[PDB]
Amino acid sequence: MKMKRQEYVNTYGPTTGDKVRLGDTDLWAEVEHDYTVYGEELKFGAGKTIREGMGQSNSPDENTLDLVITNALIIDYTGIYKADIGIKNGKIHGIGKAGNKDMQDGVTPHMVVGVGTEALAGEGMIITAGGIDSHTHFLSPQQFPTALANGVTTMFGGGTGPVDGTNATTITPGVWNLHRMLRAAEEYGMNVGLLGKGNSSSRAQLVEQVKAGAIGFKLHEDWGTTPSAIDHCLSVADEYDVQVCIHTDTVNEAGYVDDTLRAMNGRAIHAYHIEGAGGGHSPDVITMAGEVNILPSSTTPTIPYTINTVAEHLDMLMTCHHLDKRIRFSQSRIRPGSIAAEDTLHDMGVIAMTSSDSQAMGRAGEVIPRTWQTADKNKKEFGRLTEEKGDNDNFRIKRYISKYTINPAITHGVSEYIGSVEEGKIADLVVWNPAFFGVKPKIIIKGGMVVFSEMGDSNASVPTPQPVYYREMFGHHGKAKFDTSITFVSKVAYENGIKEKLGLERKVLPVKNCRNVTKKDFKFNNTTAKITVNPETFEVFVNGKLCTSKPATEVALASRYTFF
């Protein structure tokens, strides 16, 4: 039978060739393929498809899904397509066409909808992987609800709490502090991984930390990021397959940027706030982004570049670092050049990740909105990418989504477990309404269970009445949180029973394959170039061509969605 295009789209969501506007941005996602058979689409409800002996099987099957996300529009580095998503044992069991082969054509064999299957209507929704925030300062446990409310399911970084060390650096230093924090982690719904103090010119002190459970090390100038420290830290990381994150020597005390790069010696390293406002060698830290071994990320305050970015920083730097009021400027000439270039470098795929720097020169619940605001800003300034095929922004979308999903996962050695919408991976997914894409998520799924979601009046006759606000769900509570949350550790710690020894009830998984991840290993952000900074004008150059952008007067995914 012939169904009107508008009626099909209302009932099942968009199909092949349809374009979806991402929020209030000028970014258009085109459905590349639809895995359904027209007339066999699954719909849940009274008199609908998913019913006993019809869409729901009566035939027992070893692949009976625990949950079915019907008619989802997947947005992932793997593609922008329409498919049913099947969850089983807290993992993505299958992606394709779910249902009952007894009564339906074209059913994906391992996507059986049966008696034990729960239904979630994804028709007209965008499904993406849970975001990974690789620059968390564990300052406040109140960051976690803020993060989840912005589609972030995993947080790497460090801290002890509201102390000067943490306030400045992502560092949980020493054995005792690492054990304490890993045990504190039990409370939360968020997946965690802790970094220890990499700022050491002695082996023993570094080794103790990896064995204590650290997923890596943070080298930060507050503890002195000297060439000796850089070499010693990377040497231990290489031995123990853990990642190193760096905040470089801003004041060029022990050397210039090239001296730091030399100390690294082509070894894998995660360069935080690569632009340099968040910290690092002045005025040339951005030059590191061109290097193959450097895995660079950006922090939220400098992305996107706005008319208030520079003004906000010339004071935000004074509250964080606690500077004298006698200090006025240098940052007023250095900063515009690198902040502007940074946005273009993101569009070029030179900067591979976006991070927060949460309550330590950056915002916790801003990674996702700010990534899409930058994507939108560039599209608006530079136009549609030349890389695009058709009337869509699919390539740009894939480049930007990778910044907060897959690329942080690759960097930290968790890409086999999380990071993307792929069969076999843990079911850490986010459901979005297209009108609110990138700004306000609907449902947060972690380990196949809903852990956090937008919810209305608790007394109310339906879940829709006002006030609708973000609340913790069943997957975030009781002993179910131990089933849905992961505490990542080093292989040494994992293999030596850290879980049992610390009495951790959460899922404990090791980080693996950190040492041999180069720029070539990333998804849609593999660009290497000769990045140079004029020491007089502070202008940034990519292979001799001025790299810049104009500041935004207004951004997407902001004013229309927020009260304050």
Partner 1 sequence: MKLTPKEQEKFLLYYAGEVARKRKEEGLKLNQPEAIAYISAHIMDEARRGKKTVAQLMEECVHFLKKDEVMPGVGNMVPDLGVEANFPDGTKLVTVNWPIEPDDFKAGEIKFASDKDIELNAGKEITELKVTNKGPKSLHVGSHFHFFEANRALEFDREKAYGKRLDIPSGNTLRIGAGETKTVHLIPIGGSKKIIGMNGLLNGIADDLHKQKALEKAKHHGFIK
Its sign, for the CA torsion 404, 407, 412, 415, is: positive
Per CB under 8 A, the list member of 115, 163, 292, 311 interacting with partner 1 is 311
Q: CA dist 67 to 81, 119, 233, Å?
A: 20, 6, 44
Is 102 a residue that touches partner 1 (CB under 8 A)?
yes
Is 106 a residue that touches a copy of itself (CB under 8 A)?
no
Stretch (H or E) spanning 526: none
CA distance 547 to 532: 10
Residue with tokens 């693996």: 512
Residues numbered 26-45 forming contacts with a copy of itself, rule: CB under 8 A? 44-45
Stretch (H or E) spanning 315: helix 309-320
Give the residue with the Cβ less far from a copy of itself, 419 or 475. Answer: 475
Give the distance, in angstroms, between the CA of residue 305 and the centroid of all CA atoms in the same chain.
20
Residues numbered 111-130 forming contacts with a copy of itself, rule: CB under 8 A? 114-121
Stretch that binds partner 1, among 3-11, 83-91, 339-347, 505-513 (CB under 8 A): 3-11
Give the residue with the Cβ less far from partner 1, 3 or 163. Answer: 3
CA distance 374 to 21: 16
Give φ, ψ of 385 to 5 degrees: -65, 145
Residues numbered 322-361 forming contacts with Fe ion, rule: CB under 5 A? 357, 360
> Rounded to the nearest whole angstrom, what is the least distance from the CB of residue 398 to a copy of itself in the complex?
28
Encoded amino acid at 149, one letter = A
Is 247 a residue that touches Fe ion (CB under 5 A)?
yes
Q: CA dist 260 to 248, 293, 470, Å?
A: 8, 13, 44
CB crowding 155-171: b at 16 or more within 10 Å, else e: bbbbbbeeeebbbbbbb
Is 6 a residue that touches a copy of itself (CB under 8 A)?
no
Is 284 a residue that touches partner 1 (CB under 8 A)?
yes
Residues numbered 273-292 forming contacts with Fe ion, rule: CB under 5 A? 278-279
Stretch that binds a copy of itself, among 22-30, 31-39, 179-187, 392-400 (CB under 8 A): 179-187
Q: Is beta strand 429-432 parallel, antiparallel or unpaired with respect to 443-446?
A: antiparallel
Residues numbered 482-511 forming contacts with Fe ion, rule: CB under 5 A? none
Is 304 a residue that touches a copy of itself (CB under 8 A)?
no
Query: What is the token pair recorded at 31?
Result: 């459905």
Q: Are 309 and 302 in contact (CB under 8 A)?
A: yes
Contacts of 14 (CB under 8 A, 6+ apart): 20, 31, 73, 82, 124
> Rounded to the nearest whole angstrom, what is the least distance from the CB of residue 346 to partner 1 in the complex?
16
CA distance 294 to 244: 11
Encoded amino acid at 301, one letter = P
Q: Residue count at the site for a copy of itself (CB under 8 A)?
A: 124
Q: Which does 503 bind (CB under 5 to 8 A by kind): a copy of itself, partner 1, Fe ion, none?
A: a copy of itself
Give the residue with the Cβ less far from partner 1, 6 or 386. Answer: 6
Query: What is the token pair recorded at 236?
Result: 């231990």
Residues numbered 227-266 forming contacts with partner 1, rule: CB under 8 A? 227-229, 251-256, 259
Is 343 a residue that touches partner 1 (CB under 8 A)?
no
Residues numbered 504-563 forming contacts with a copy of itself, rule: CB under 8 A? 504
- 321 in active site: yes
Catalytic residue selected from 281, 321, 412, 476? 321
CA distance 468 to 473: 14
135 known ligand binder? yes
Per CB under 8 A, the list member of 109, 383, 463, 497 interacting with a copy of itself is 463
Q: Which does 105 bind (CB under 5 to 8 A by kind): partner 1, a copy of itself, Fe ion, none?
A: partner 1
Encoded amino acid at 254, one letter = A
Residues numbered 486-505 forming contacts with a copy of itself, rule: CB under 8 A? 502-504
Q: Are 350 and 289 in contact (CB under 8 A)?
A: yes
Q: Which does 483 bind (CB under 5 to 8 A by kind): partner 1, Fe ion, a copy of itself, none?
A: a copy of itself
Residues numbered 50-89 forming contacts with a copy of itself, rule: CB under 8 A? 50-54, 56, 58-60, 64, 66-67, 88-89
Contacts of 227 (CB under 8 A, 6+ apart): 254, 255, 259, 260, 262, 263
Q: Are 372 and 24 in contact (CB under 8 A)?
A: no
Q: Which does 187 bind (CB under 5 to 8 A by kind): partner 1, a copy of itself, Fe ion, none?
A: a copy of itself
Q: CA dist 287 to 218, 290, 407, 520, Å?
A: 20, 6, 20, 18
Is 23 a residue that touches partner 1 (CB under 8 A)?
yes
Per CB under 8 A, the list member of 170, 226, 344, 378 interacting with partner 1 is 226
Q: Which does 495 bind (CB under 5 to 8 A by kind): Fe ion, a copy of itself, partner 1, none?
A: none
76 known ligand binder? no
Site string for partner 1, 104-123 (x = CB under 8 A): xxxx----------------
Residues that bind Fe ion (CB under 5 A): 247, 278-279, 357, 360
User: Which residues are known catalytic residues?
Assistant: 321
